[PDB]
Structure formats: C-alpha cells, structure tokens
Design a binder for this molecule. Structure first.
Ligand SMILES: Nc1ncnc2c1ncn2[C@@H]1O[C@H](COP(=O)(O)OP(=O)(O)NP(=O)(O)O)[C@@H](O)[C@H]1O
Ligand SMILES: Nc1ncnc2c1ncn2[C@@H]1O[C@H](COP(=O)(O)OP(=O)(O)NP(=O)(O)O)[C@@H](O)[C@H]1O
Ligand SMILES: [Cl-]
Ligand SMILES: [Cl-]
Ligand SMILES: [Cl-]
Ligand SMILES: [Cl-]
Ligand SMILES: [Cl-]
Ligand SMILES: [Cl-]
Ligand code: NA
Ligand code: NA
Lengths: 816, 816
C-alpha cells in the first residue's frame, strides 16, 4: 500500500454589514403598489432624480425584500456603509450617539450616502415593530447605472454608424454626437413627425413600428433600425411625410441645435474631413497644420461640371480635388492618368507659384471638383510668398516636434527658422566628428547620413530628420559621428550664437536644466537624503543629492504594504506608465524609478517654490492677470494630458507646485487614468469632483475642466463654490449636484463670472471647453482677451509670485 | 474672501471575470420551460443533486440571463473562476490549450468547479452563434445555500422549543435532534396520519391547514404551529385520530428511529436531565461525575403515592427526590419544611451510611417520588464503603482539574489519593514559609488560609482549594507563604517521595519539562536562532535557544504582508486566542507571542521526533496496535478541542508532530475556529475534507471525525480512500461526494474496516462519534477492544516509533 510522497496545501478563509442583511433576505413578487412606492422614493433620491421612467424601473427590479422583527439591528454607527433602504411597512427608530432622534415608516428612506461611496455610518437604525425594508447595495446600484448608460451609449453609436450623413465624421466626432442623442418615447397614434413641418430632428427607431403617410395616404411601415431626418440636420426643409407610431416604440434622436453646439455646422465639419483626407495624400499638404487644411476646406471653390468639359486649360488654380466623378489629366496631348473620387493633382504648381500651369484637365463624366487658387493658398499661409512660406512652414513643423523648440514663442521660432543656413556635403564627409565640441544644430534637407560611434554603426537618417541639438545648450564632446552617406547631401543649420540671441535666460535655464536629467543614470546607492520635503501617508518624499554631479532631486518612497492592502497592484504600474511618459514644461518630469522588496520609488525633478495652495493664500484674491497666469498654466498641462487620452481626475491647488522661476508643475498622478471610452469609478477629491462622476452614468476628460472651474472660483472669489463649510461628504456632493452657484458682490469682472459659470456647467455638453474645439473655446474666451498664450509656455511672462529661496510643505526593473 | 487653511484627501479606486459578465447581463421573465430546464440541469450538478424541489426552485430564481453574439469571450484559461453556466440557446465551443475540443448547446453545463472554490480555469468557452447563458456566481450560490439550510435549522429549532416533550432536553441535545428533522410535503386530501396506525413520527405544521377526524367524524382544524405525535416518540400507541391536509401544507417531522440513533432512548435521556438537575442541588452529588449521576437516574426507584402517606418512617433509602407534588419533612413531631417539585433531601444520610434514618416524610398530595437506596449508591460508586468512596471521589475531582494529575492512569490516581495524610494547624501557623524548599502538596480540608509574599498579601483560599504542587516536580524555594487564617485548619497532603513511587519516568519527564515553560519570561533579544526547522510559505520556523536557561524552543515567524494581502487580519488573532488556550499533552503548548512592525511570532515548545506523515512512511502499513496508538492519540486531542467548541478543520498527518518519547503533538491551528452554531466557510485540505463542508449546507465539529476516518484509512490501507491519484480538486471532491469506498484484499481486520466505514459515513447523523455520546462510541468500538485509553494519556504505552536523535522537516501586546 504505497503512499504518495509529495505537498498538498489547504484552502483558506475569507463585509460585515453584507453578512447581516443576508439573514433577513427573502423572495417576493413585485406588485403594482411596490413598484410605484419604490419609483416614488427613488425620484426623491440625490442620485436618481435625473433618471427617466425606464431607468428607474430597471433599478426597482434589482431591489431586494428584507424582513425584520422588533428590536433587531439594521445599521450601526461607525460601521462601513453598503446598503440603501426604503421602508415598506412598520416603524424604524434612529439612534445618534446611542440616543433616539427620529421615527420613520412607509415611504421614508435612509443610508443614501452608502450608494455614493463606502462611508462610515452616522446613526443606528433600529426596528420597532415587525417591519420590512426594500434594499440595494452600492455594488449592485453602481453596476446597474454603468450598464444602463453604457448600453444606451453603444446602441446609439451603432445607430450613428448606420446613418449615411455621419459616414465622414471622424471617430472622435461620432463619439461626441452620440452623447447628444435624446431618447424619445412614442405611444400608438402619436405622430413622430408631421408632413410640412420645418423640423430639425433626426429620428432612429430602436424597437417598434411606425406608419408613413404622404398626403394622408399610407406608403409603408418602418421597422427597428429605420431612420429619417438626415436632411433636416443640414437644411431647412419641410418633412416629406407624416410618420405615425403603430405599436409602443422607442426612438434615439438628434437635434440640429445640440449638434451645432457640440460639433459646429455639420456641412462645414464634413467637408473639412473630406478635404483634409484628400489634401493629405500630397506630401506638401501633409506638412500643413489642421487649421491650415481646414481653412483650405472652408475657402475652396467647389464647382459641378458636365462631361467632356475642360476644367483647366494652359485662372490661378494651383490644386484640384475630385469630390465626385472622374477627370482625365493631360500633358499637351498625352493623357497622364484618370483621377477618381478623392484623388487630386497640382503638387508641381503648389510648389512653384510663378510656374505656368501646363496640364489640362478634362471631365469624363458629370463631376464635382474643389479648386485651390493661389490666393486661397496665400490667405491660408498669411503670405503672398507661397514658396517661401511653405518652406518656412516645413522647417517649423520639424522643430515644433522637439522639446527644445516647441514651447518657444512664435516670434522666436520664426526668427530662428529665418536664421537657418544651408551647406552641401560630399559623400564620406564628416558632418560631425565624435569627440569635438559642437556649436551647430542640423536638419537634413536632401539625402542620407550615418550615425556611428567608435567605428560601430548605430542608425541611418534621411530627409527632415535632425541632429546635434545638444550643441545649442551645452559645450561638450559629440558622442557620435555623422557621416554623409549619399551623393551631395544638404543640411540646414543654425549656430549656437544665433540661438542665444533669440532664446532669453528663463527658457534657456529651463532647457539647460531639463535636458541634463537623462544624461545621469542614477543608482540608489549614489543618492544621499538631505531632508524630508513631503509626507503623503502612502510613504515619504525625501529631498536627495546625487554625489557625482551634485544635481538635486525629489525621491518619493511608496510602501509595498500600503499598495497591497488597498488592492492597488493594478493601479501603481498604470501610474508609473503615465508619470514616465509626461514630457511637458508645466508637468513634473520623471527621471527614473527603482524597485525594492520594501517600497517603490519615483525619482523626479525637485521643485523649490512650494504648493499653489499656499501661494494663493499669500496673494489673497488673485487679480485678473494673476488668475490668467495660473489658470492658463493649468490649462496647458491638462490639455497636454487630454491630447494623450489621460484624465487627471484630481485637479486641485495642492497638486500643483511652483518652480524657482514661479511657473507651475502639476504633480501626483495617483488618480490619473488612460481613458478607453467612458469612465465610471468614483475617484478624486469631493470639493473638486464633477457632478457626472458622482451621478455614476459615465464620464470622460471633461471632469478636469469642471475642476478648473472650481480652481478659478477659489482664485477669484476666495472660497470653494460648493460645500465650502461642509465636512460631511454627502452634503458636499449635494451642494455640487443641486446647490446654487453664487458670486460675492466684490467680484467686479463680468467675463470672469461668465467663464466661471461655463466651466461650472453641470451638464458636460453645456460646459465650455467640452465641444469639438476643446480648449480653444476657453483660450479664446473674453477672460483671456488680453492674455498671450504664446509667452506663457515660453516663460516670457512675469509670474504672480517668485519664491525668495527654497520652500517646502514642511510645517503645514518591472514593477510587480 | 478668506480660505480654509485645513487636509481634505481623495477617494481611491477599486474581479475581472465579474466585470465581463456584467456587460452581457439582461432582465428576463422566467417561463415554465426555463425553470424546468434549469431545474433539470441542477439535478445533474455535483453539489445540487441531494437538494429537494423547493431548494432547487430557490436557486433557479437567483440565476441571471446572459446574452452573447458569435465569436465573443465567456471564460478564458488561467483566469480566476467565479461563474457556473447553463446554455439556454445556441452553440458554445471549448478551447483547451487554445485548440478546440468540444461543442455544447441547450441543456449542457460548464464551470461547475467555480461554485465549489475560486479556481483556475481549464478551458476557454467561446460563443459560436448568437447564444444565451443562464448564470450564477459562487458568492450568490454559497450565500443562497447558507440561508436555506440556516433558516431551515432555526425554524425547526423553534418548533422543537414549542414541543412540550422536549422541554427537559439540554441545549446541546435540542441542537442535535434539530438536525434529525425531515421536511415532509402534503397535498390536499393526503392523510398525514391515520386513526389506529402504530406510528412513530411527530409532525409539526410549518405553514398550512389540516382537518382532524375521530371515527370518521370531523373534530377541528389545525393551524401553523400545531403539532401531534409526542407520545409516539415515547411509546407504542395507535394514533388517536385521522389528520388530513386541507390546503397545500408543510410539516417538520421527527421519527423515533432517528431520535434513538442520535439521542438514545428519549425517556432515559429526559429522566437523567431531571435527576441530574435535582441531585446537583446537593453539595455532595455536585462532586459526582455525569456518568455517576446518570447511573443514579437509571437505577432510582420511582413511586407514586396518594396524599397523606408516610413514604419514610424511622428500607435503606438515603436520598429522596420529588418528581411531582409535595411532601412535608418531619424530625419527630416538628415539620422542618415542605419539598415541592425538583427539591430533595437526605444529605445527612448519604454522608453517614450507618446512621439511622430519623426523619419522616409525608405526602401532602398525590405525588411522584424517586428514591436512592444505599445499594443504588454502592452500585453507582462500585463500593460498599460509601463514606470512604465519596471522600475518595471528592479528592479525585479536585486533582483531576489540575494538569499534573488529570492525565495520570486511574490506578496511579487512586494510589495517590489513598496516600493522602491529614494535619491540623493553629491560626497564625505557617503552613508553608517563603524561601524554603518544599516537599509537599496540599488540599484544604477545613477552613481558610492566606497567600502572602514579603508581607504584602496576594489572595485567600478555602475548602478544596489546593497549593504547593510544584514542590512535587522541582526542588526550589517557595515563592509565597501560606498562613493559617482560621481556627483549626485541616489539610490533606502528599509527600514528593510518595508521588515519585507512583509516577514513572516518561510522565515525570513530560511534567518536569512542561511546567517550567511558564517560569521563564522570554524576550525576543534573549533568543538566538540555531537553524531553520520548517518553512510554511507564510514565513519561517526557526529553532531557537534561550541563553539564560538554555531551554530550546520553536519560533514561528509570520509576515505581516502575507496576512494583510489575504484579508486574514480577522483570522490571525482568532488563531492566537485558540493557540494560547490549548493545554493538552498531545497538542502543542504555546509559551508566548511577540509583536513587530514586520512580522508576528509564535514561541512554542520544540518537538524533536518529526512529522507523523514521515513516521507512517517509515513504518509502512501500521498494524492494529500502532494504528490504535496514533488514532487514539489524535482522538484525545480532537475530543479536547470539541469540548471547547473548537473545530480543527485541517486534520492530516502533516499537522501532527512526534515528541522525543514518540507521543503525538497536534500543531497548526490556522484553519481552527470557535464554533458558534453551524459553520459554512470552505476551509481545509481537499483530500481530508468532509462532504458536508463541500456541499455548503452547514457543518460542525463532526468534520474532524470524518478526517479521522481518512487518517485511519491511510494508516491501515495505505493510500487515501478518495482521489488518491487526483491533482484536480474538482475530481477529488467528486470522489469524496460520490466515489465508492473500497478496501484492498490485504486488510484482514473486520473491526478496522467497520470503523473506517463508520468514520467515513457521508451523512454526519450516520457517522460514528457524532451522536449524543460523542467519542465514547469510537473509544468503545471493537477496534479498540484491547486498547487501554488510560495508559495513553499517562505515557504508559510503548509507542510505535521512537526517534534516534532529533529530526526536523529539513530536506522534505495585542495583535493588530
Ligand atoms: N518633486 C517634488 N519637489 C518638491 N516637493 C515635492 C515633490 N514631489 C512631491 N513634493 C511634495 O511632497 C508632497 C507629497 O507628494 P504627493 O505625491 O502629492 O503625495 P500624496 O500621497 O498624494 N499625498 P498628499 O501630501 O495629500 O498630496 C507634495 O504635496 C509636495 O509638497
Ligand atoms: N514546535 C515545533 N517543533 C518542531 N517543528 C515544528 C514546530 N512548529 C513547526 N514545526 C515544523 O515547521 C513546519 C511548518 O509549520 P506550520 O505551522 O505547519 O506551517 P504552515 O504555514 O501551516 N505550512 P506547512 O509547512 O504546509 O505546514 C511544520 O510542518 C513542522 O515540520
Ligand atoms: Cl478621432
Ligand atoms: Cl464654392
Ligand atoms: Cl558643429
Ligand atoms: Cl448543553
Ligand atoms: Cl422505578
Ligand atoms: Cl512542604
Ligand atoms: Na498632492
Ligand atoms: Na502543518
């Protein structure tokens, strides 16, 4: 009887409030009177008041029946809060500080805070008689609101995808109008649209049927998926029919007024997408900015031609795009090809404005053409010298991709571009030699070069690649050779001397200090700690000193056990990702991280001007110029993150530091997330939290713009706008959701107010900065009318507060 | 606009499989065909086959509807398993190692292992067509089985509490027959009992109605709570009526056959409770053992008397108990009192068997009396010398409460008692003087004494208290004085010399070594570690050395992070409690614990003979004497724990060590729990786990007796009895639940087999050792027929294996 000599291990054991309710739970059929009472009760709830009948009915069916005897415990003070309760029968007594206060019966509600967030209870509800409770947990409640709003969104998106007039909207644009869909119920007999009405609404049947009439005579019936009113979004046209609902039926609907707010003029937007797609097939226009291309689209002459028409024959047309049909191109008598839908022609003439248009173009069928004239281009470029502007703008788009140049003012960036000189090299010429001290930066005009180090080759570089930019900031040996490996290579270049006549001290200091940070590979043992400069509860923030180079850093220490206990294993690596990739002047720059069996580490630049929380407190109520500066700065950082699909989620003055020059640095990305669709989790600081996070029906990047509203309000008015005196979170969220926004009598600037109201608009679609234009609407708001956004990023503005000496918050390797 | 200078902190973020299913979830009305398919599907499930129709219907309604499209993910390999699924429509394909295997449609089931326990998936189920799934999670499934069985139990207990014939059962006894209740459905017209039937079943109406007939003539109707058949449990009597159900109705029912198995003869048990309550009002019989009192109850002469009858008048009646009515006591012509129901008399005559009964007793009304004669007492005591036995047994019950004496053989304990001598002291006499070396142990016969140290007093001690027992084991100074603080105090005493002629080396060594352990207050810094002697994964087990005394210990180190990550904050303190209180020779003795910011610590005695797992492997198949010894030993440890309402829950040879003498020590109380009612959590080692833990309908201490069956099977037969080859847990639990128990042809002992079958009885009520007698049925089983339980606890048996030198498992301050 041989025995296994293996070893086999045992299974181990795993709310408290959720255990008690499980004892009282029973099944019950949901009568008419039950459904209507719950339905009435929820419409007085903080969260559920905005919900329509269909959504509340779904919630109702997820409620569970609970049965209690007299003198039985329901909820206790200081326990973790999970359930919300509607009393169905009997009486229930409320003990606060173990001393009776209230008495509740049928219709009454309690524990509404548990739905919003896991929260410590206030009272101890006790059962007097043999009474009963309808109840639901947080998890179930939040999950249910997620699925209702999420399915609503996805279904409406599919319907957007099957309406032909939206076919040429971009991904982002379709997602934005999906949110403008309003669901609209119809009973039998209700006319959905009437013949001859000048309606402006598109309808899409979700489920149901509807009869179509023309001049009171039935024509057909419409089934689930059918739609009507496309043309009503583009033009003022009477309805071609009377459509009447046969059975109970549900429509997803979009109105032109909301579309125009969210999207702008739909024709204008569609055409820009079409033109931008066409123009970007050319290597010339692919180097234009989106704004330039949109202006070409807005100003293009569009013409319909019959077949066999000579559209061009050797005005001042430089470029031609086929919108519809087909044309044939000819050089003298030789056809050179046929252009179909979306193809275009004219690169040669766009590049040489003085050149005689030699080709001819002949329609093969009835066609629609867009034409770009010379003056159309010049308006777009702001300059009659087309060839020079195009060249200038080619150089501009190369350097605006590099950290060193992309934040310089426009005037500085232009001067620098104009200072470029050109040299030609023979093959085998050493453009740069490893070990020598450089004074030049290079952009490749023509041909190819080879990057080498001590003989061994590293890579190859070609047209419009750049190299040697460090020579502009430091005097140091070149760490590689750049060898001309083609016939007659041409480079653009700029001398360090010219660069220093253009860039002014503060930006130069910022750049000098910043680019150095990657040079120095830091090891933990090379760091000594000077002092503590912060204390996050999670761990510590030590001010550290790198002995070899004497550069000073901040080291954030983050205990393993604090991460493990809260189930933040998933979240800490997502933070490291976001933190590592951030490369903006007003956002903290990570240097590297370190691993350890006891605690994680973030090594970041040291910021020496203290928190913004304390700066506004030194300044008092900020004037317009001071609020422009700080809000401006925050706007650029936030906009940078939204461009990368990152919602910050915790914007507040505490999370912004000031550097030595008085310019801001956003820190603390613990709440930040890469936004893949709609977010639902409840994260952030209550006073700064947007109502859509609280209401649990989906949010996006828009939440950070609401927070921006809160910040401007504190800056200009002083107190927070909602729940300024409140400790109790429930009451904070109540003021956020339903409180009145007011402004004190000492706020004398109508534009500041206008701006604060529109940033603090409760519905995201009404909120400035949340439409198709994004932050442009904010930046161009009259509040910023006198404010030079250009000089902000380029450190050319006198900031509100420059710290005398250093100031810290003192008295106040894969991660797995 | 002053600002709050507080700080406000942010809210943070918190299955994976549970997130996906939430997307596919929809509402659906449960039709007849749905309910019957689910109902059919569950009756083929490993867990749900034993469940009756009402229980399965409750499960059915908790199932949720899920809707999928073609090529959508349901379950993935290597993910954490939560749901069980019944396919309602369409086809579903099963990928193992990412390579297709099976095809499933309507009626088919998958993921049944997820219900039992959180487990890693085997396949990836994928949706081919637009098919649908009925599904339920583990949490919901386990919670639902908890509530059904728990409410069933509580309701049946209340009904037990309202049946008069059970009024005199103890708490424990009522709880045991509650489990014998069988629920029995009746339709309209079905006769529940028939007039003249010799039925043996008690019925209790839960909900419903039923008509009573005598001689075919209606008498009354019965309502919810009404019951009938009390007398059928006690006697063979025809039913007095025909009771027929009017409406659909549900009965809780107890049968005499099951009662007799669970409880024994109900009359006999009731009477013992009544007699034991009465007899214990006397200070004499309160010193008797439960067995002695039960024998007095079983043999008492019971008589009914008319009023005004002289029951006693100056046979050999020594004691008298009034069962019914009232009697008056008289000394000659003076009444000395009236004895009502449950009162008794005769202390004077019980203590002096030769004394002439001088009182007389006169019934005041019709009465029932129990009488205890002299020979009744003598049979109970095993001795004609009543006064001497009573005295002997008074001494016995004093010493059997002390560790030092309570495990000695009976013959040794008797000899020692017989060796007691008596001295008398004057007041102010120093019975013991602090600082002197003692040779005596003392029990106080009469009067009081005072414990003092250096003048300051500590406590007072009186009749039948004891002191100075350490003088029996060590030669050392007395740490306190014992001063006679009453007139003419009398002590019993025994000399060390006499004690050493009775107790033999092995027990003496055990006692010497054990009692020392409390003397030495250990501090962490006084410990140096010699080596590692174990590695639990949770942490380490170091062999440590106390420098001052040179005593050697085991130190178990338990990392904080291992506790925090698994949510074992609740459980580690419950373990420390249980571990600290254990004070049995065959269970590991804790010395103390220590706290630390990095890891918890258990300091325990060092055990040097290695695990039992390895010992049976050296021995091979154990003979009868060797299996008796180890199983015997385990039985005493387990019985000790059950007496303290502790279920061990992880009994297996790995959790038992052998000491230097070859006697066992149960270790590792991580799975152990103080059992407050029925337990539900799934804990332990699969191969040792009892079917009632697996089936999720409640368990108790009985689980450890099933495990004992597993152990005996490995000892005698060799392999495990269920799932001996299986790694896959699902298949282990399947063999436990429905597998056939077989025994190899080389097992030649019919009693061993009999025992193994009854320990491995699947239903707890059929399992030996789980009835009212507890372990007595096991200890008296013919398997143990030649085995001296007395010598086991007293270390008077040659054990199976004595280790040559030490052997470890080497190559193989409130806690918050
Ligand atoms: N690079 C830095 N330079 C200077 N001070 C810093 C730097 N990083 C962090 N600090 C300071 O350290 C504090 C704590 O850092 P932070 O990442 O916000 O921690 P936390 O866990 O989110 N808790 P909290 O203190 O409420 O913000 C900050 O508020 C700053 O005052
Ligand atoms: N007092 C002791 N004397 C000698 N060996 C001991 C002692 N305590 C523990 N050990 C050994 O250390 C091992 C680990 O202890 P244990 O408490 O069972 O840890 P665990 O976390 O449950 N894991 P496991 O090793 O599977 O049992 C035991 O199996 C013994 O071999
Ligand atoms: Cl897009
Ligand atoms: Cl036009
Ligand atoms: Cl150079
Ligand atoms: Cl009891
Ligand atoms: Cl009798
Ligand atoms: Cl003594
Ligand atoms: Na912060
Ligand atoms: Na163990």
């Amino acid at each position: 009887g041989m025995r296994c000599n293996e070893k086999k291990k045992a299974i181990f054991s795993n709310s408290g409030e959720d255990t008690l309710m499980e004892d009282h739970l029973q099944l019950r059929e949901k009568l008419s009177e039950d459904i209507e009472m719950i339905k009435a009760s929820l419409k007085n709830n903080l969260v559920c008041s905005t919900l329509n009948d269909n959504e509340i009915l779904t919630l109702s069916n997820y409620m569970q029946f609970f049965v209690f005897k007299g003198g039985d415990l329901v909820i206790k003070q200081g326990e973790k809060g999970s359930y919300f309760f509607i009393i169905n029968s009997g009486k229930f007594d409320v003990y606060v500080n173990d001393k009776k206060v209230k008495s509740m019966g049928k219709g009454s509600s309690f524990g509404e805070a548990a739905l919003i967030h896991n929260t410590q209870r206030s009272a101890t509800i006790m059962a007097e008689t043999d009474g009963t409770l309808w109840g639901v947990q947080r998890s179930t409640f939040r999950a249910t609101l997620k699925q209702l709003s999420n399915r609503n969104f996805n279904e409406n998106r599919s319907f957007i995808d099957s309406v032909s007039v939206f076919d040429m909207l971009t991904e982002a644009q379709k997602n934005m109008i999906t949110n403008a869909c309003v669901i609209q119920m119809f009973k039998p007999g209700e006319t959905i649209v009437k013949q001859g009405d000048y309606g402006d609404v598109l309808f899409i049947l979700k489920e149901g049927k509807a009869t179509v009439f023309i001049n009171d005579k039935e024509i057909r019936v419409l089934n689930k998926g059918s739609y009507f009113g496309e043309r009503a979004l583009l033009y003022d046209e009477p309805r071609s029919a009377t459509i009447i609902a046969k059975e109970p039926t549900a429509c997803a609907s979009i109105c032109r007024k909301l579309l125009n707010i969210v999207l702008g003029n739909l024709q204008v937007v569609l055409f820009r997408n079409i033109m931008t797609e066409a123009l970007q097939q050319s290597e010339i226009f692919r180097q234009f900015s989106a704004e330039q291309l949109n202006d070409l689209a807005d100003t293009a002459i569009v013409r319909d031609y019959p077949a066999n028409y000579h559209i061009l024959h050797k005005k001042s047309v430089k470029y031609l795009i086929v919108l519809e049909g087909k044309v044939e191109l000819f050089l003298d008598d030789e056809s050179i090809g046929i252009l179909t839908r979306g193809k275009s022609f004219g690169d040669q003439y766009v590049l040489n404005q003085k050149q005689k248009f030699r080709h001819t173009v002949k329609s093969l069928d009835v066609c629609k053409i867009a034409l770009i004239t010379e003056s159309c281009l010049a308006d777009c470029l702001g300059d009659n010298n087309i060839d020079a502007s195009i060249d200038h703008n080619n150089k501009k788009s190369i350097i605006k991709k590099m950290y060193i140049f992309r934040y310089l003012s426009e005037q500085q960036c232009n001067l620098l571009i104009e200072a470029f000189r050109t040299t030609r090299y023979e093959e085998g010429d050493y453009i740069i030699q490893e070990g020598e001290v450089g004074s030049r930066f290079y952009i490749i005009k023509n041909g190819e070069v080879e990057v080498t180090k001590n003989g061994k080759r590293l890579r190859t570089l070609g047209k419009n690649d750049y190299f040697g930019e460090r020579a502009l900031l430091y005097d140091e040996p070149r760490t590689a050779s750049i060898i001309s490996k083609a016939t007659s290579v041409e480079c653009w270049f700029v001398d360090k001397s010219v660069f220093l006549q253009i860039i002014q001290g503060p930006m130069l200091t910022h750049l000098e200090e910043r680019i150095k940070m990657q040079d120095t590979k830091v090891e933990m043992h090379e760091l000594e700690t000077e002092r503590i400069i912060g204390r996050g509860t999670f761990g510590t923030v030590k001010l550290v000193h790198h002995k070899p180079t004497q550069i000073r850093y901040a080291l954030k220490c983050v205990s393993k056990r604090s991460i493990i206990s809260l189930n933040q294993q998933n979240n800490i690596k997502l933070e490291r990702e976001i933190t590592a990739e951030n490369d903006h002047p007003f956002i903290i720059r990570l240097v590297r991280t370190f691993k350890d069996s006891n605690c994680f580490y973030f090594l970041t630049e040291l910021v020496t001007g203290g928190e913004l929380y304390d700066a506004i407190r030194k300044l008092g109520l900020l004037s317009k110029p001071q609020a422009q500066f700080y809000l401006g700065s925050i706007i650029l950082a936030i906009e940078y993150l939204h461009e990368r699909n990152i919602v910050y989620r915790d914007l507040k003055p505490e999370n912004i530091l000031l550097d030595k020059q008085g310019y801001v640095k956003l820190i603390d990305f613990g709440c930040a997330k890469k936004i893949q669709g709609r977010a639902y989790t409840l994260v952030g600081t209550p006073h700064y939290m947007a109502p859509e996070v609280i209401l649990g029906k989906g949010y996006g990047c828009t939440v950070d713009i609401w927070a921006l509203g809160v910040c401007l309000y504190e800056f200009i008015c002083g107190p927070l706008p909602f729940g300024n005196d409140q400790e109790d979170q429930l009451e904070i969220f109540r003021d956020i959701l339903t409180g009145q926004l007011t402004f004190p009598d000492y706020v004398s600037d109508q534009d500041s107010i206008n701006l604060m109201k529109r940033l603090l608009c409760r519905l995201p679609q009404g909120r400035i900065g949340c439409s198709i234009n994004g932050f442009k609407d904010i930046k161009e708001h009259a509040f910023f009318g006198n404010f030079n956004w250009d000089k902000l990023a380029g450190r050319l503005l006198e900031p509100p507060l420059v710290s005398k000496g250093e100031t810290y918050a003192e008295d106040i390797d894969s991660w797995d």
